[PDB]
């Protein structure tokens, strides 16, 4: 096969355990044999991050910004148990949280639909896309234990007193021990969130819903509502009217209820935390947490980070190390690669690359849909409880490879 | 019965707004007052009443509930920008529910009202899912504000007793541009109450209990909910759980909502204030309709209760009612607010006759739909029946329930 020439380099972030094993096979068998790619490799395994005191994560984020497209393998955020078992320096923060904070933007999540997989919410016939604000709020929050009675205040001091007033807000007078936290966001970040959301709505020709709790957090959430409306009237109003699509702000309560009783087919812009929770509800409702894509996008339309949206399970790895067979789904990791390559193709105007990314995806879905070859989790979701109903982690990937070859020849 | 049942202690009634107020009075006159000799401590929480008393009536009502033990509340309107304008309100008064919950503290238990006949949007949900929502702080008592430009943001705590605690000045953020900020709190006392009520309900209903948090991100704040529940659990409920064969477990909110969507129901989800607010609507919708859900606020000591109609009022229905136009609004949620409240009243006063009445009221109400197929517009549409004849009017439904109440009260 005559290899497709990728013009610009692609930033690759390796991950942990089982997904790392899967990641290497995908790269060696499904990508490298067909593409001549310059991969800027960053090892984000727990061991690598510990050894560099998490500096490797920051470097990888900056590389993505430099080159434009990053593709990331699922990683492990160590807990107390792991820190002790592997003698880590500390409970390192989520590489994902770190990358999102550095790149900023929006994380778009949507189900990977496989006809055969049963939907847990039957009426969802059309994809629901979650546009999760990638920055601030709880993920960059300051929280602390309050040991006893005392006052708690939120204090703001402008860098320039003549252009702004200081603020000292009474938060609470404790009468006993408790907890406290403060969080923030910026208008610039919220504005980018809005631009990407409106642009995706336009590009996909879908209605856009922004949801908040601005009835309770009148200033904080109210700010998201006002910025979205302002951006809407600044550059997208007539575009939406021309396409016949709509933008509407809704109370988060009402939105999730309408989402649950709908047929899908719309985009839900959500604050960082709500986007996190709801994307799992949506992924699960469509069929499986393992069938979801996740791509971080910056408002300038120049930077993308495609990540394996399905976490790795240490149990599978344990069995893998013991030489026992496994059946871990590799679809989410395959799509991280395909969606990243698609952005690379678009940015570089390399149609041959985009075509490849699309067949890689169809060959993967058809292996399941048409050939009935799948891993344990999907077989089970399908009510196929026979041992012979699924193949091993490696068998699935070998099947996809064979399919990729076959489908590539057809063209 | 036809003699009337003597309710020993007064019941606090909080009247509401628009269409729900209309249904509320009909319920009282036809389904409650004719059978019960009850002393109702009436508090009008309509928008006009609250505006006239500068929201003082809401505070008085909450204190009456604490004084007498049981309150029954009709749905109320939380004014927004437009409403303040159209009705010249003095202020955008805060939600009465948030005010009442802050004063009484405790936990709000949300549970679906199951009518087997009504289709479920999440098919596998065959067993009730109960949401135990912490009713106190977090974002419902938060302090939020806009940040005009560059400057420092700090969370400052000053202990009342310098010897037992140190002051804290935590740098929240250094703005380089305008943005938003907020701070919130909760207390060990409130969280402990939340835990006790949750474990007791689990033991009472013999269901597994899951507490969900984002303690991976909010290590101190959310970690406190996790630690207090575990302490309380091991100290006085673990043994009983083990005897009953039920389990308690803490889960990441991400995993829990996914497991919830994939499950068959049959468990209690203890959730922080905000998550409980959002997830209860998802659960209510999933079982069939937002209008089929009960909501009862319970205090830890077990002596105070506020049964509320969770089904918000709809202005369009009210406007039609005003014009004398035909209406078909569901009253099931309002009926259960009364029944559930009367049950608490009966249990506290040890009045078996009241509890029997409350139960027959509920049975008559649901059988009116389940057996007689008599229902309002929303339920009929839920059953995929769009013909006019498929449903009855608001009044017709209530008359049907009243008739069955009389039938089933002699039976
Ligand atoms: O890194 C983590 O802890 C999870 C981040 C996340 O929400 C995602 O990758 O979708
Ligand atoms: O008053 C409000 O804004 C809604 C409160 C709520 O969530 C409830 O009553 O269940």
Swiss-Prot record, chain A:
Binding site for Mn(2+): 253, 276
Cofactor section: Mg(2+); Mn(2+)
GO BP: any one term: isocitrate metabolic process
Predominant location: mitochondrion
Free-text function comment from the UniProt entry: Mitochondrial IDP1 may regulate flux through the tricarboxylic acid cycle and respiration. Its probably critical function is the production of NADPH.
Record-given protein name: Isocitrate dehydrogenase [NADP], mitochondrial
Cellular localization per UniProt: Mitochondrion
Keyword list, A-Z: Glyoxylate bypass, Magnesium, Manganese, Metal-binding, Mitochondrion, NADP, Oxidoreductase, Transit peptide, Tricarboxylic acid cycle
One GO CC term on file: mitochondrion
Annotated positions binding substrate: 77, 94-100, 109, 132
Binding site for NADP(+): 75-77, 82, 261, 311-316, 329
MF terms in GO: isocitrate dehydrogenase (NADP+) activity; magnesium ion binding; NAD binding
Stretches assigned to coiled coil: none
InterPro entries cross-referenced by the UniProt entry: IsoCit/isopropylmalate_DH_CS, Isocitrate_DH_NADP, IsoPropMal-DH-like_dom
Domain of life, source organism: Eukaryota
SUPFAM superfamilies: Isocitrate/Isopropylmalate dehydrogenase-like (SSF53659)
PROSITE patterns found in the cross-reference section: IDH_IMDH
Subunit structure: Homodimer.
Catalytic activity: D-threo-isocitrate + NADP(+) = 2-oxoglutarate + CO2 + NADPH
Signal sequence, renumbered to the chain: none
Reported induction: By growth with glucose as a carbon source.
Regulation: The enzyme is subject to end product inhibition by NADPH and 2-oxoglutarate.
One protein family per Pfam: Iso_dh
Lineage of producing organism: Eukaryota, Fungi, Dikarya, Ascomycota, Saccharomycotina
Enzyme Commission number(s): 1.1.1.42
Family membership noted in the UniProt record: Belongs to the isocitrate and isopropylmalate dehydrogenases family.
């Amino acid at each position: 096969f005559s290899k497709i020439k990728v013009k610009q380099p692609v930033v690759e972030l390796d991950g942990d355990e089982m997904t790392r094993i899967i990641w290497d096979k995908i790269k060696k068998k499904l990508i490298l044999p067909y593409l001549d790619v310059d991969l800027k490799y960053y090892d984000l395994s727990v061991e690598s991050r510990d050894a560099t005191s998490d500096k490797i994560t920051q470097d990888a984020a900056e590389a993505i910004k430099k080159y434009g497209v990053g593709i990331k393998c699922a990683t492990i955020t160590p807990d107390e148990a792991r820190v002790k078992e592997f003698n880590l320096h500390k409970m390192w923060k989520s590489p994902n949280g770190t990358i999102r904070n550095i790149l900023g933007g929006t994380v778009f999540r949507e189900p990977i639909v496989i006809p055969r997989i049963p939907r847990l919410v039957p009426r969802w016939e059309k994809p629901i896309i979650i546009g999760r604000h990638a920055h601030g709020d709880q993920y960059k929050a300051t929280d602390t234990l309050i040991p006893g009675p005392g006052s708690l205040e939120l204090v703001y001091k402008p860098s320039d007193p003549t252009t702004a007033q200081p603020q000292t807000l009474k938060v609470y007078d404790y009468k006993g021990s408790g907890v406290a936290m403060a969080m923030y966001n910026t208008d610039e970040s919220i504005e980018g969130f809005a631009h990407s959301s409106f642009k995706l709505a336009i590009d996909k020709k879908l209605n856009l819903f922004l949801s908040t709790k601005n009835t309770i957090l009148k200033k904080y959430d109210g700010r998201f509502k006002d910025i979205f409306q302002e951006v809407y009237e600044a550059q997208y109003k007539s575009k939406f009217e021309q396409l016949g699509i709509h933008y509407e702000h809704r109370l988060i309560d009402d939105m999730v209820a309408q989402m649950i009783k709908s047929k899908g087919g719309f985009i839900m812009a959500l604050k960082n935390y709500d986007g996190d929770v709801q994307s799992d509800i949506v992924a699960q409702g469509f069929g499986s947490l393992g069938l979801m894509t996740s791509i971080l996008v910056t408002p300038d339309g120049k930077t993308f980070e495609s990540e394996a949206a399905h976490g790795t399970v240490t149990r599978h790895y344990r069995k893998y190390q013991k030489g026992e067979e496994t059946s871990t789904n590799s679809i989410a990791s395959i799509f991280a690669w395909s969606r990243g390559l698609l952005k690379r193709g678009e940015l570089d105007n390399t149609p041959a690359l985009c075509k490849f990314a699309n067949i890689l995806e169809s060959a993967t879905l058809n292996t399941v849909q048409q050939d009935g070859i799948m891993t344990k989790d999907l077989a089970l979701a399908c009510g196929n409880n026979e041992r012979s109903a699924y193949v091993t982690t490696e068998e699935f990937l070998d099947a996809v490879e064979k399919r990729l070859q076959k489908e590539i020849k057809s063209i």
